mmCIF file of all heavy atoms in Angstrom:
data_model
loop_
_atom_site.group_PDB
_atom_site.id
_atom_site.type_symbol
_atom_site.label_atom_id
_atom_site.label_comp_id
_atom_site.label_asym_id
_atom_site.label_seq_id
_atom_site.Cartn_x
_atom_site.Cartn_y
_atom_site.Cartn_z
ATOM 1 N N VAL A 715 -1.840 0.725 5.324
ATOM 2 C CA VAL A 715 -0.830 0.036 4.524
ATOM 3 C C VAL A 715 -1.126 -1.456 4.484
ATOM 4 O O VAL A 715 -0.933 -2.118 3.461
ATOM 5 C CB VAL A 715 0.576 0.331 5.060
ATOM 6 C CG1 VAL A 715 1.624 -0.398 4.247
ATOM 7 C CG2 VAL A 715 0.838 1.826 5.058
ATOM 8 N N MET A 716 -1.593 -2.015 5.606
ATOM 9 C CA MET A 716 -1.986 -3.428 5.621
ATOM 10 C C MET A 716 -3.161 -3.680 4.679
ATOM 11 O O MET A 716 -3.185 -4.697 3.979
ATOM 12 C CB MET A 716 -2.339 -3.865 7.040
ATOM 13 C CG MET A 716 -2.698 -5.335 7.142
ATOM 14 S SD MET A 716 -3.118 -5.843 8.820
ATOM 15 C CE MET A 716 -4.719 -5.074 9.015
ATOM 16 N N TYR A 717 -4.144 -2.776 4.672
ATOM 17 C CA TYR A 717 -5.274 -2.925 3.763
ATOM 18 C C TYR A 717 -4.807 -2.909 2.310
ATOM 19 O O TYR A 717 -5.261 -3.727 1.500
ATOM 20 C CB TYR A 717 -6.302 -1.823 4.004
ATOM 21 C CG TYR A 717 -6.905 -1.807 5.382
ATOM 22 C CD1 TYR A 717 -7.444 -0.652 5.911
ATOM 23 C CD2 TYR A 717 -6.939 -2.959 6.154
ATOM 24 C CE1 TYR A 717 -8.007 -0.633 7.168
ATOM 25 C CE2 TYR A 717 -7.494 -2.947 7.416
ATOM 26 C CZ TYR A 717 -8.023 -1.783 7.916
ATOM 27 O OH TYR A 717 -8.580 -1.772 9.177
ATOM 28 N N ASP A 718 -3.919 -1.986 1.971
ATOM 29 C CA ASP A 718 -3.392 -1.932 0.605
ATOM 30 C C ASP A 718 -2.621 -3.204 0.261
ATOM 31 O O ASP A 718 -2.752 -3.738 -0.850
ATOM 32 C CB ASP A 718 -2.521 -0.704 0.417
ATOM 33 C CG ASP A 718 -3.325 0.574 0.325
ATOM 34 O OD1 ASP A 718 -4.568 0.490 0.263
ATOM 35 O OD2 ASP A 718 -2.719 1.670 0.323
ATOM 36 N N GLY A 719 -1.810 -3.694 1.200
ATOM 37 C CA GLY A 719 -1.053 -4.903 0.942
ATOM 38 C C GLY A 719 -1.928 -6.125 0.741
ATOM 39 O O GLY A 719 -1.646 -6.972 -0.106
ATOM 40 N N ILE A 720 -3.009 -6.229 1.519
ATOM 41 C CA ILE A 720 -3.944 -7.329 1.342
ATOM 42 C C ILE A 720 -4.692 -7.177 0.019
ATOM 43 O O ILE A 720 -4.939 -8.168 -0.685
ATOM 44 C CB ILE A 720 -4.913 -7.395 2.528
ATOM 45 C CG1 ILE A 720 -4.149 -7.751 3.808
ATOM 46 C CG2 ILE A 720 -6.010 -8.410 2.281
ATOM 47 C CD1 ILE A 720 -5.003 -7.752 5.046
ATOM 48 N N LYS A 721 -5.058 -5.948 -0.346
ATOM 49 C CA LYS A 721 -5.772 -5.718 -1.588
ATOM 50 C C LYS A 721 -4.905 -6.014 -2.814
ATOM 51 O O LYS A 721 -5.437 -6.403 -3.860
ATOM 52 C CB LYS A 721 -6.278 -4.271 -1.630
ATOM 53 C CG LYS A 721 -7.049 -3.898 -2.880
ATOM 54 C CD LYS A 721 -7.433 -2.432 -2.852
ATOM 55 C CE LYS A 721 -8.007 -1.988 -4.184
ATOM 56 N NZ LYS A 721 -8.269 -0.522 -4.202
ATOM 57 N N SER A 722 -3.594 -5.848 -2.690
ATOM 58 C CA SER A 722 -2.715 -6.062 -3.841
ATOM 59 C C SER A 722 -2.781 -7.500 -4.333
ATOM 60 O O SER A 722 -2.891 -7.753 -5.539
ATOM 61 C CB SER A 722 -1.276 -5.680 -3.486
ATOM 62 O OG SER A 722 -0.744 -6.554 -2.508
ATOM 63 N N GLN A 723 -2.709 -8.479 -3.424
ATOM 64 C CA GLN A 723 -2.849 -9.891 -3.791
ATOM 65 C C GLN A 723 -4.298 -10.331 -3.611
ATOM 66 O O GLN A 723 -4.657 -11.094 -2.701
ATOM 67 C CB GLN A 723 -1.900 -10.762 -2.978
ATOM 68 C CG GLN A 723 -0.428 -10.586 -3.326
ATOM 69 C CD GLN A 723 0.195 -9.391 -2.655
ATOM 70 O OE1 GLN A 723 -0.339 -8.860 -1.691
ATOM 71 N NE2 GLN A 723 1.350 -8.975 -3.149
ATOM 72 N N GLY A 724 -5.146 -9.846 -4.507
ATOM 73 C CA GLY A 724 -6.545 -10.230 -4.503
ATOM 74 C C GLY A 724 -7.396 -9.353 -3.599
ATOM 75 O O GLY A 724 -7.818 -8.268 -3.992
ATOM 76 N N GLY A 725 -7.654 -9.831 -2.387
ATOM 77 C CA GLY A 725 -8.426 -9.072 -1.431
ATOM 78 C C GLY A 725 -8.706 -9.869 -0.180
ATOM 79 O O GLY A 725 -7.860 -10.652 0.266
ATOM 80 N N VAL A 726 -9.889 -9.679 0.404
ATOM 81 C CA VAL A 726 -10.287 -10.483 1.561
ATOM 82 C C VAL A 726 -10.408 -11.947 1.172
ATOM 83 O O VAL A 726 -10.222 -12.839 2.008
ATOM 84 C CB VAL A 726 -11.591 -9.932 2.167
ATOM 85 C CG1 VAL A 726 -12.739 -10.069 1.175
ATOM 86 C CG2 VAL A 726 -11.916 -10.639 3.468
ATOM 87 N N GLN A 727 -10.707 -12.230 -0.101
ATOM 88 C CA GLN A 727 -10.896 -13.600 -0.552
ATOM 89 C C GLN A 727 -9.607 -14.403 -0.432
ATOM 90 O O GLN A 727 -9.532 -15.377 0.328
ATOM 91 C CB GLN A 727 -11.404 -13.604 -1.994
ATOM 92 C CG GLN A 727 -12.836 -13.128 -2.142
ATOM 93 C CD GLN A 727 -13.785 -13.796 -1.172
ATOM 94 O OE1 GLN A 727 -13.851 -15.028 -1.099
ATOM 95 N NE2 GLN A 727 -14.526 -12.998 -0.426
ATOM 96 N N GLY A 728 -8.576 -14.014 -1.175
ATOM 97 C CA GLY A 728 -7.362 -14.803 -1.239
ATOM 98 C C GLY A 728 -6.078 -14.038 -1.009
ATOM 99 O O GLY A 728 -5.058 -14.321 -1.647
ATOM 100 N N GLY A 729 -6.108 -13.077 -0.091
ATOM 101 C CA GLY A 729 -4.916 -12.312 0.214
ATOM 102 C C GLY A 729 -4.776 -11.989 1.685
ATOM 103 O O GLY A 729 -3.974 -11.139 2.068
ATOM 104 N N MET A 730 -5.561 -12.675 2.521
ATOM 105 C CA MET A 730 -5.561 -12.403 3.952
ATOM 106 C C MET A 730 -4.353 -12.975 4.670
ATOM 107 O O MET A 730 -4.147 -12.656 5.846
ATOM 108 C CB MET A 730 -6.841 -12.960 4.577
ATOM 109 C CG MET A 730 -7.966 -11.947 4.679
ATOM 110 S SD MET A 730 -7.415 -10.387 5.372
ATOM 111 C CE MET A 730 -7.613 -10.715 7.111
ATOM 112 N N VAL A 731 -3.549 -13.805 4.005
ATOM 113 C CA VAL A 731 -2.365 -14.383 4.636
ATOM 114 C C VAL A 731 -1.213 -13.395 4.707
ATOM 115 O O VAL A 731 -0.258 -13.624 5.467
ATOM 116 C CB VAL A 731 -1.945 -15.657 3.878
ATOM 117 C CG1 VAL A 731 -1.419 -15.308 2.490
ATOM 118 C CG2 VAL A 731 -0.936 -16.475 4.671
ATOM 119 N N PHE A 732 -1.273 -12.294 3.967
ATOM 120 C CA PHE A 732 -0.197 -11.312 3.950
ATOM 121 C C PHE A 732 -0.269 -10.325 5.108
ATOM 122 O O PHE A 732 0.606 -9.463 5.218
ATOM 123 C CB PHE A 732 -0.196 -10.551 2.618
ATOM 124 C CG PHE A 732 0.283 -11.372 1.461
ATOM 125 C CD1 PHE A 732 -0.587 -12.201 0.776
ATOM 126 C CD2 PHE A 732 1.606 -11.319 1.057
ATOM 127 C CE1 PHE A 732 -0.145 -12.958 -0.291
ATOM 128 C CE2 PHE A 732 2.049 -12.070 -0.002
ATOM 129 C CZ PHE A 732 1.172 -12.894 -0.684
ATOM 130 N N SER A 733 -1.288 -10.416 5.961
ATOM 131 C CA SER A 733 -1.355 -9.578 7.142
ATOM 132 C C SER A 733 -0.307 -9.943 8.185
ATOM 133 O O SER A 733 -0.040 -9.145 9.080
ATOM 134 C CB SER A 733 -2.746 -9.652 7.766
ATOM 135 O OG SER A 733 -3.015 -10.959 8.233
ATOM 136 N N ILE A 734 0.281 -11.150 8.084
ATOM 137 C CA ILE A 734 1.288 -11.573 9.039
ATOM 138 C C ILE A 734 2.509 -10.656 8.972
ATOM 139 O O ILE A 734 3.133 -10.358 9.995
ATOM 140 C CB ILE A 734 1.683 -13.041 8.790
ATOM 141 C CG1 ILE A 734 0.437 -13.913 8.732
ATOM 142 C CG2 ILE A 734 2.628 -13.535 9.868
ATOM 143 C CD1 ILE A 734 0.730 -15.374 8.491
ATOM 144 N N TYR A 735 2.855 -10.198 7.770
ATOM 145 C CA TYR A 735 3.983 -9.296 7.621
ATOM 146 C C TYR A 735 3.797 -8.037 8.459
ATOM 147 O O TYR A 735 4.668 -7.667 9.255
ATOM 148 C CB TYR A 735 4.171 -8.938 6.137
ATOM 149 C CG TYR A 735 5.195 -7.861 5.874
ATOM 150 C CD1 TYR A 735 6.538 -8.183 5.698
ATOM 151 C CD2 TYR A 735 4.828 -6.532 5.768
ATOM 152 C CE1 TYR A 735 7.473 -7.204 5.450
ATOM 153 C CE2 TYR A 735 5.766 -5.548 5.516
ATOM 154 C CZ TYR A 735 7.075 -5.893 5.353
ATOM 155 O OH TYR A 735 8.021 -4.908 5.102
ATOM 156 N N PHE A 736 2.643 -7.382 8.326
ATOM 157 C CA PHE A 736 2.384 -6.157 9.064
ATOM 158 C C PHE A 736 2.224 -6.413 10.558
ATOM 159 O O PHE A 736 2.692 -5.615 11.375
ATOM 160 C CB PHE A 736 1.150 -5.452 8.512
ATOM 161 C CG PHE A 736 1.240 -5.146 7.048
ATOM 162 C CD1 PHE A 736 0.708 -6.016 6.113
ATOM 163 C CD2 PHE A 736 1.868 -3.999 6.605
ATOM 164 C CE1 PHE A 736 0.794 -5.734 4.765
ATOM 165 C CE2 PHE A 736 1.961 -3.721 5.262
ATOM 166 C CZ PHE A 736 1.418 -4.585 4.339
ATOM 167 N N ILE A 737 1.571 -7.528 10.934
ATOM 168 C CA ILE A 737 1.438 -7.847 12.351
ATOM 169 C C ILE A 737 2.802 -8.006 12.998
ATOM 170 O O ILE A 737 3.094 -7.400 14.035
ATOM 171 C CB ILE A 737 0.576 -9.116 12.534
ATOM 172 C CG1 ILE A 737 -0.860 -8.865 12.085
ATOM 173 C CG2 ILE A 737 0.620 -9.570 13.981
ATOM 174 C CD1 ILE A 737 -1.703 -10.112 12.100
ATOM 175 N N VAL A 738 3.677 -8.824 12.389
ATOM 176 C CA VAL A 738 5.009 -9.035 12.934
ATOM 177 C C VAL A 738 5.774 -7.722 12.955
ATOM 178 O O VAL A 738 6.432 -7.396 13.962
ATOM 179 C CB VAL A 738 5.742 -10.121 12.133
ATOM 180 C CG1 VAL A 738 7.236 -10.085 12.438
ATOM 181 C CG2 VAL A 738 5.165 -11.483 12.423
ATOM 182 N N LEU A 739 5.712 -6.948 11.869
ATOM 183 C CA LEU A 739 6.457 -5.700 11.806
ATOM 184 C C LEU A 739 6.079 -4.768 12.942
ATOM 185 O O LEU A 739 6.951 -4.312 13.686
ATOM 186 C CB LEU A 739 6.223 -5.020 10.455
ATOM 187 C CG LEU A 739 7.158 -3.858 10.145
ATOM 188 C CD1 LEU A 739 8.605 -4.244 10.371
ATOM 189 C CD2 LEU A 739 6.953 -3.379 8.712
ATOM 190 N N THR A 740 4.778 -4.489 13.123
ATOM 191 C CA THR A 740 4.384 -3.541 14.153
ATOM 192 C C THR A 740 4.645 -4.095 15.552
ATOM 193 O O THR A 740 5.150 -3.377 16.427
ATOM 194 C CB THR A 740 2.921 -3.121 13.977
ATOM 195 O OG1 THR A 740 2.612 -2.061 14.881
ATOM 196 C CG2 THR A 740 1.968 -4.282 14.203
ATOM 197 N N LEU A 741 4.344 -5.383 15.771
ATOM 198 C CA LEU A 741 4.512 -5.978 17.085
ATOM 199 C C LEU A 741 5.973 -5.954 17.517
ATOM 200 O O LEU A 741 6.275 -5.660 18.682
ATOM 201 C CB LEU A 741 3.976 -7.406 17.101
ATOM 202 C CG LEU A 741 3.578 -7.965 18.467
ATOM 203 C CD1 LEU A 741 2.488 -7.133 19.096
ATOM 204 C CD2 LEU A 741 3.136 -9.411 18.332
ATOM 205 N N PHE A 742 6.884 -6.268 16.597
ATOM 206 C CA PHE A 742 8.301 -6.239 16.935
ATOM 207 C C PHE A 742 8.817 -4.809 17.032
ATOM 208 O O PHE A 742 9.629 -4.497 17.906
ATOM 209 C CB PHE A 742 9.107 -7.048 15.917
ATOM 210 C CG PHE A 742 10.267 -6.283 15.311
ATOM 211 C CD1 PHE A 742 11.517 -6.301 15.914
ATOM 212 C CD2 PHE A 742 10.106 -5.574 14.126
ATOM 213 C CE1 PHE A 742 12.574 -5.614 15.355
ATOM 214 C CE2 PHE A 742 11.161 -4.886 13.569
ATOM 215 C CZ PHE A 742 12.401 -4.905 14.188
ATOM 216 N N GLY A 743 8.365 -3.924 16.138
ATOM 217 C CA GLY A 743 8.911 -2.583 16.101
ATOM 218 C C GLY A 743 8.586 -1.782 17.350
ATOM 219 O O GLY A 743 9.471 -1.124 17.915
ATOM 220 N N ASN A 744 7.339 -1.847 17.814
ATOM 221 C CA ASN A 744 6.973 -1.078 18.995
ATOM 222 C C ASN A 744 7.856 -1.454 20.183
ATOM 223 O O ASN A 744 8.516 -0.592 20.786
ATOM 224 C CB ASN A 744 5.498 -1.314 19.325
ATOM 225 C CG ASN A 744 5.038 -0.571 20.567
ATOM 226 O OD1 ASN A 744 5.726 0.335 21.058
ATOM 227 N ND2 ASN A 744 3.891 -0.957 21.090
ATOM 228 N N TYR A 745 7.943 -2.753 20.475
ATOM 229 C CA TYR A 745 8.644 -3.183 21.684
ATOM 230 C C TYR A 745 10.154 -3.120 21.512
ATOM 231 O O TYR A 745 10.869 -2.873 22.491
ATOM 232 C CB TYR A 745 8.178 -4.577 22.081
ATOM 233 C CG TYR A 745 6.702 -4.605 22.422
ATOM 234 C CD1 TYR A 745 5.861 -5.577 21.896
ATOM 235 C CD2 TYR A 745 6.149 -3.660 23.267
ATOM 236 C CE1 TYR A 745 4.513 -5.604 22.208
ATOM 237 C CE2 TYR A 745 4.806 -3.672 23.579
ATOM 238 C CZ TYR A 745 3.993 -4.639 23.047
ATOM 239 O OH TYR A 745 2.650 -4.656 23.361
ATOM 240 N N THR A 746 10.666 -3.294 20.292
ATOM 241 C CA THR A 746 12.102 -3.180 20.098
ATOM 242 C C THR A 746 12.557 -1.734 20.210
ATOM 243 O O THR A 746 13.590 -1.452 20.819
ATOM 244 C CB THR A 746 12.490 -3.770 18.742
ATOM 245 O OG1 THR A 746 12.424 -5.194 18.806
ATOM 246 C CG2 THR A 746 13.909 -3.354 18.352
#
């Protein structure tokens, strides 16, 4: 899902900033 989300806004070139959403989501969800 993170790969698809990054690919939606361009790709590795100009869409790598959207990985923060998935990082925060999984990191908070597991421990919460």
Side-chain angles (χ1 to χ4, degrees):
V715 179
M716 182 180 73
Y717 298 156
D718 286 353
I720 295 176
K721 180 183 171 186
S722 67
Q723 290 82 17
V726 64
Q727 290 311 307
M730 266 312 273
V731 69
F732 288 85
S733 64
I734 308 180
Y735 172 88
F736 304 95
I737 294 173
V738 165
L739 192 50
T740 188
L741 203 60
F742 127 89
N744 179 15
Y745 298 132
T746 286

